[PDB]
Amino acid sequence: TIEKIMGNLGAADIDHKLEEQLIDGILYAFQEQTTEDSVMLNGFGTVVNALGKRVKPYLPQICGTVLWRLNNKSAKVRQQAADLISRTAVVMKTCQEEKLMGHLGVVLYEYLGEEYPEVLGSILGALKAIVNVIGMHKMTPPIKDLLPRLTPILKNRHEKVQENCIDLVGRIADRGAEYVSAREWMRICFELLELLKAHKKAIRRATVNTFGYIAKAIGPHDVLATLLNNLKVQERQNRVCTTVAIAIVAETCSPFTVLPALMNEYRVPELNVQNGVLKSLSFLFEYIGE
Amino acid sequence: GGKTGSGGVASSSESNRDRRERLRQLALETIDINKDPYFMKNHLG
Amino acid sequence: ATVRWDYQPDICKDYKETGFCGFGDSCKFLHDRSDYKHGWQIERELDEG
Amino acid sequence: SYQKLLKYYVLNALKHRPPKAQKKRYLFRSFKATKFFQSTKLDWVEVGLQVCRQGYNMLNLLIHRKNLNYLHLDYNFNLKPVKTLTTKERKKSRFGNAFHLCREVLRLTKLVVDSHVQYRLGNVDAFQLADGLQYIFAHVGQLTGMYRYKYKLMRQIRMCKDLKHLI
Amino acid sequence: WEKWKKLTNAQRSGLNQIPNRRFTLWWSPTINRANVYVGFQVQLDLTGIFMHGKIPTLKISLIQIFRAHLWQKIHESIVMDLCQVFDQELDALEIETVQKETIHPRKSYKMNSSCADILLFASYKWNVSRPSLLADSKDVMDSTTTQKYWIDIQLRWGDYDSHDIERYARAKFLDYTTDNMSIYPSPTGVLIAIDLAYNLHSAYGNWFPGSKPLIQQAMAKIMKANPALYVLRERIRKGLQLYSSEPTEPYLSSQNYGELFSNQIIWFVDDTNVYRVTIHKTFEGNLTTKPINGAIFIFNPRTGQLFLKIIHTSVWAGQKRLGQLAKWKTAEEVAALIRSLPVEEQPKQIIVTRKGMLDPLEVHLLDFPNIVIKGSELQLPFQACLKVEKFGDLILKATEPQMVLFNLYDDWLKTISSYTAFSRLILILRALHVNNDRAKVILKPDKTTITEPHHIWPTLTDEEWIKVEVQLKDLILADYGKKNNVNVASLTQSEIRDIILGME
């Protein structure tokens, strides 16, 4: 009810003591949680979404709770607290939580060492949902140390952590991209080359997008060289996704940069690769159009 | 005791590609040692 | 007693530069990719400043 | 402690040789009879600071003649690198029990000389000087770090603990 | 404790160093002590830890805990927070200006000499005592005056052989103030020692009006709140791979007992029921009453120790009015107590029910003037200790005023904390306070539950102990609702906690 109510109406008239007992019953509900439900999550998200700026004085309380939960023994509650962070992430800042949003930044940089995929994925989600509000160049762990830490995670062979990791690296390569070195981007290219075999298609589309972003940050030529050598692989669904990626690189950085190399590669006498070239031109003419 | 300065271990896809290539050289060797004029490798491999 | 500065931290340099140590769990050094000013870099730069 | 000092005494008595042989070099006369050596009478503390300065210079000349610019030996005789050293320097700059045993013996004498310098500069005391000297000699183990280069030192170190206990 | 891909040779063999690394981090104040045989001392790189050897496993753990200049960042946050406290309370303390010395970027981890942290500028003049410990009360702000104060923060990392931080703070103060290298821009200040390995704190220095309670509170809040410290504690937990099991962060709120169960003593005194009269009527219609014996209650809950100083009505003869002269007795009695105490049970802060009785014992306790005395903002049901069968009849039929000692923690200190035994106790005491009858039936549920004759409470198991915790607390809530017209499902977690615990 309360969630439906304040979500439709707004929280203008909710006075002091009322809002207090509300925030507190909220904390209780969320700890007391004993089911895997978005019920209490969405309740929390909405309630602080409407408290807007009313929530300043309880951020020690709210976080301290969430952090003690983040310390727990059983995975489930840990994961829950990571979720709840990913909800309230925006208001965490918007109340100017220097100590506190700084907290969540560095402390999650700590938990990046987990080995329960179910918690590691949620941690990556919460870090992404912090970086969305606070941009790159005032992140509490500078992405100059974040992304180097992230690259050895791309090898985690699990759908949820892989989804969220490639999401975070795609954000960074899109916008950050210059607090990192060319060599870092090259290693990360070589790791992306084998996300193209995940069993989930969201991962593979995210991978192709980030190949695009890396072609924008670094020049196209080295990434294109690393894509042709992948075309030489067999098994079709990672050949086809590298051929999408070639199309994407060519679309962003103009097609004259890549067309000669594609055409020239049409001469290596192998089948899978001549067909890779032809399929890539297919996608390319679709993407560029007029 | 391993050594420092090394990459990883080749992944099954690369191991497969090079198993293939080695097999092909095995074939070229045998058709060499058996001197076949009835052979071709076509422009598609 | 007579104190020193314990000078070289133990930073598996294969890991730190290339994110990958061939030894894995047994690398007797510290898996760490953190660039950060050292125990003498700062001293020297400040005093030269 | 009593018993282990007894043991040392007995062994010394048991293993005693007559001096068995003689040839009779005199190092310092052979030195003085040469045209490069002069002589004097000086103050102890003065020759002490002298000896320490000379040792420091010798060892630094050794390093810098070996062209090891990235290492520097400071004044309490600790050796400290001023860079991060690559492999080739990590290796070229290794030293052995000779170099390090001198280093640490010089460090012992420098600590002694400098307690005496504190006293004669006037900061401390006769009683504070005597107690400090007693310290230095009992706790050579944790001031210098010579045992790591001649681990047969722990003969001595156990002897000085046993004395300390008795006294 | 902490309930494919293809690997190269040296991955498929060679040990795993991580469990060795965490065994060493856990056992580390022993593996790294200071009283050693031969071993040459050395400072860890960017910090103030000493090693007396070369134990690479331990050095790696410790280094990776203190990465990114965490040691100095801790020093800088602690100094900022102290500043801010002074920023605020300038007014009451007469502080005209507050001076934070622009920092030498190496003051935190140079250990034999010190700049200073906070320069305090009065408005007019402070008259200042001699130095004592931050846990000692009687302070004579008379000796000197000044407008210049310095404040020092020194961080250590103690170990098993040496982690007393009172004597650390004393020695560092005496030395660093009578040395010839530390540049103190005043002849007066204070030194505040933090022990990061044991999360301890204290201070020694020259004080002035307000400083003792001001610092005491600011320190106890920093040690709990600061964000640097939090990152420290959190790298430590994760390098150990330790997890908690309790949800809700048991009852550690900035309330006193997270300060109180500490290895430093704190006593709890009840003198509300030392005077009691028992009433029965005459054949005359007048209900005449006879005075009966009483008892001062002294408690150490980090021990489960009661001194029961039973008062006799031998003193009801010719003392004019009961209450204030009773204040006077309690005063001189606790004074004699400290006199007769040996040097490892000497009390450090003593909190009484009677905030009105602090003054007489305040004055009387100057033969032992180290005593932080207070009145407790959380009254604990030692008045419900009149209810039990052993203690009561003891007092009632005693003839000579006397001392007794009980260990209310019957066998508990084997398989619970002083924390948990104190909490459970509070449950039991308040249960006698509120009902005594549902109390009997809850704490002796089984027909043949027994007590060993040296027990205050029966011999249970953990199962029924957790069950009866919930039961007694159910009772406390039920009875609050019954005597205040309330829904007990209505209360919030804070409300139920604080009604269970004390006042609000």
Ligand SMILES: O=P(O)(O)O[C@H]1[C@@H](OP(=O)(O)O)[C@@H](OP(=O)(O)O)[C@@H](OP(=O)(O)O)[C@@H](OP(=O)(O)O)[C@H]1OP(=O)(O)O
């Ligand atoms: O390890 P060490 O260099 O010898 O010195 C210490 C210390 O010496 P200092 O007083 O010289 O600082 C005490 O020795 P005493 O003064 O008591 O003789 C001490 O003795 P306690 O701790 O027992 O008081 C202790 O002994 P141990 O390490 O066996 O506990 C030990 O002296 P020793 O190492 O010579 O024993």
Ligand SMILES: [Mg+2]
């Ligand atoms: Mg080898």
Ligand SMILES: [Zn+2]
């Ligand atoms: Zn390594």
